Symmetry: C3
Amino acid sequence: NITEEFYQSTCSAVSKGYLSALRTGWYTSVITINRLLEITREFSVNAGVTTPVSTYMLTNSELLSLINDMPITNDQKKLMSNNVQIVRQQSYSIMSLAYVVQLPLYGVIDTPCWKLHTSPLCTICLTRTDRGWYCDNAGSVSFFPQAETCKVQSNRVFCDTMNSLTLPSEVNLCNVDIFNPKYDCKIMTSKTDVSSSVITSLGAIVSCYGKTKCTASNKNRGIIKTFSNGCDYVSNKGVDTVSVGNTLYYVNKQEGK
Amino acid sequence: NITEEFYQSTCSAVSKGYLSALRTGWYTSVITIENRLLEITREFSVNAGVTTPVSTYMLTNSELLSLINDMPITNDQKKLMSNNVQIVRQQSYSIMSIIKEEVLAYVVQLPLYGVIDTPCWKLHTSPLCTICLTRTDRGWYCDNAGSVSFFPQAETCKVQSNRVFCDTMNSLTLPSEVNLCNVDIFNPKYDCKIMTSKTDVSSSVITSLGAIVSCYGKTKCTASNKNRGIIKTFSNGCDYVSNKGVDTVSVGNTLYYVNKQEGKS
Amino acid sequence: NITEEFYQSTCSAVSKGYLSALRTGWYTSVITINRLLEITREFSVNAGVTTPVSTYMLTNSELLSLINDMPITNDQKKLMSNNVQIVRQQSYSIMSIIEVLAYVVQLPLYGVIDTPCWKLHTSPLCTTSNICLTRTDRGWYCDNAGSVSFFPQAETCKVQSNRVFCDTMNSLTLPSEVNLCNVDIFNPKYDCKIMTSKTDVSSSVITSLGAIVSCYGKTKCTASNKNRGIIKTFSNGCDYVSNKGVDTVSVGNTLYYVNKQEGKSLYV
């Protein structure tokens, strides 16, 4: 269900097909008491505040029981129930044996999200500067600039709205045209050639300029492409590595023994 | 007394009343050991020789107060750290040393606060439309030797009650005139950082003691109470809600929760 | 081998002499299994994903064995072998499905090595109604296939001795002409990023081998030695101090510590 589109005119790639869950609240629960030994160790090691929330601190069934108590839709309950791993990673446990457990509440769910990657475009060079995750919100778009804040599992993304930036939909036009009149796209500029590569979700972007030699290879077939002056995109189905000068980039994870 | 002031003219809220402690140094101490040893060994194996926070196994409550007493600082400083060992541990590191022949040696690293008891405030912001503007520099501010230190990454400051503890390592220094941006974005004494839009935008932001709601264009925004129900239907404006009288806010189909929701005990 | 240059004209300092290793890939390995107890605890505490990769999860020798399997040069293998601590810190371990316990270990592959890196620190510079400027792009820079990779988040780079290990995931690519911003902020070959003020500002910044002190307006700033007390009183300007000769700096009532302060030892 996940796709990636490449836009040569702006030297940027967009990974689409994700579905959202945006944290807009917290649900708290007070808890009192072999298992006690593990809880005690955790709090001693982390000075009274832990994350993720471990199974010792809260068991798989106790968690589902709390999910059921939460004041939310059934589709929401169902979604959290299938992603306890992420839910735990976005939760906190705080000592006050008494301690308080703190779980996320998702204000909105099943909205489109996409991730944006960018590379230099030269003729002078321009690079778009607003990389990261975007999600549709209440008719606008929430943008999440810090990579830490969004967790992905298959086609589901879970983001924290605490430090998000709200933007109009017209930002999408920057993908096609950097000089568009409806929104002022953020860019960075240079007066000299620059070459590099960026690994994206389903491939890689290669910006190759000036005298630099750039090549792409396959583990079995060796060198399959030599690039010249341009901005190009390569699929992870047909390419395993990219080379920019003497720097080697790996498009796929390299499976070991 | 912690308070929150809302400023409609800039669509921003400021949480005030905090008192500061800014880390400007480190105090180190070498520790040797010939049950507790088992826990220390595990910690270092799991964290590849460097840990934070500093656990009670690595350094006991009384050993810690003893070190706080050794540190070259004021008594009010000593008193402050003594009442906040939890935070102090969270801002400290423990580093394993060489593989000795007959002992386990490691170094413990504790914060030294270069200044204390200065005012801090936290700034939240939401979009203001008339074309829209949003102020950009959210986060913690603290007074510092006649200027203001600004801490843009939320991770860097720890709060407990009315005390804040921040790390000066990656701070930005600014003049006091930055306060004037709260009331007037177009003031002549300082260039307030803003982000702009040519189209309507709607959103909400949860603050410390409430929430801000920016509602523009065709979007429906409402605020509700548990008891009662819908109190307020908003139209085109920037409004603030107190967490004493409102529990939830709705922007289009997105629901925001102003209070933490208390669950089964 | 490691030096630091101060540039008064820009109120900035550059630490040089480091050598690079830039992560551009991952090497994965599937693993099946007293030791089992520790592994189980780690996954229960961290909800199935851990970093760093512990000795329980992967032993010192198993690690070197994997380093030997990796498709890379010998100098690379030699470098990682001397820095297992860092390698573990940059690696992940992820549990799978289901005494029959499977998990995947994830190690960095360094696309390039032994290139120069430097770190950039900056402080406010004020002049003339006063105007004041601060350069905004602090952090690590490394040479990379004829250009320069910049790493703005401090988290991403780990240092040990004169070696730096950085993650290219969130890097920004820049031309070499950025170096000219060290000497001249208003240079014509590159547009240096700056932040501005219309009022005086004073502060200090601790660098790798010293500290920078920006002292302006009515503020009093001093520098001291433990063995000699006050050795300098500053006036309106931007100055640098070496950590060999100075231990503390004072800006108004705020005290900064240039060196780590050695304390009392304990025994158990």
